[PDB]
Design a protein around this ligand. Sequence first.
Ligand SMILES: CSc1scc2c1-c1nc(SCC(=O)C(C)(C)C)ncc1CC2
Length: 148
Amino acid sequence: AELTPILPFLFLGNEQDAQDLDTMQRLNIGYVINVTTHLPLYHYEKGLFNYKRLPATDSNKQNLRQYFEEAFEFIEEAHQCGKGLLIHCQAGVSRSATIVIAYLMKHTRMTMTDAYKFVKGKRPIISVNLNFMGQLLEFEEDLNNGVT
Ligand SMILES: CSc1scc2c1-c1nc(SCC(=O)C(C)(C)C)ncc1CC2
């Protein structure tokens, strides 16, 4: 169980990272984003956290752009309320790391490459997915022209 802290309040993890309840409470995590279609929302009935499911598959066909704004408003909410947010998908964090990078691109005005450099430096293992990479590329261009 190794929840990588990207920002003071924003943590990246995987399938098993999201089940270490004690770890989540030590870190004052109040919000969880589960970026799968099929994994359960872990610890839902213990009513301790606010959840958001981004029902996405790890393919070269899945669109994630659609989930970006939804996910940023929920990270902003964990920040405005002084709590931490965990975002996880499965092994290799393809889906969840795509979203973290997009957040760092909009709400830190980092570049694409520089966000990836930054995340991979805190979490070494990241599966490649050129579909998501290409979608981050057009997100970067929609930001530099101000369509967001
Ligand atoms: C924005 S990713 C990026 S930008 C420039 C490069 C890369 C890169 N990424 C990955 S893995 C991560 C992914 O595919 C994501 C799911 C996060 C989109 N492996 C190799 C490279 C080579 C150079």
